[PDB]
Amino acid sequence: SNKVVMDEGAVEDIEEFREEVARPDAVLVKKPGKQIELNVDRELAAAHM
């Protein structure tokens, strides 16, 4: 699963964003001036392994 930290207006539809982020085939639309940071923490998985 992805963790998402973003500007408050990154995505118009937050529900579909919430559902489709983990999807490897999803098409995501974001507003121009609002940044998206998917995969906030992934070195944690290697640390736990």
Partner 1 sequence: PFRHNRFSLTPIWGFRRGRDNLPYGVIRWMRDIQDDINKRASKALYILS
| Touching partner 1, residues 27-46 (CB under 8 A) | 44
How far from 42 is each of 10, 13, 29, 39, CA to CA, in Å?
A: 21, 25, 23, 6
- Smallest separation (angstroms) from partner 1 to the CB of 48: 7
Q: Please give the DSSP secondary-structure letter assigned to residue 24.
A: T
Residue 11 burial (CB count, 10 A): 21
49 binds partner 1 (CB under 8 A): no
47 binds partner 1 (CB under 8 A): yes
- Smallest separation (angstroms) from partner 1 to the CB of 44: 7
Write out the residues near partner 1 by the rule CB under 8 A. 44, 47-48
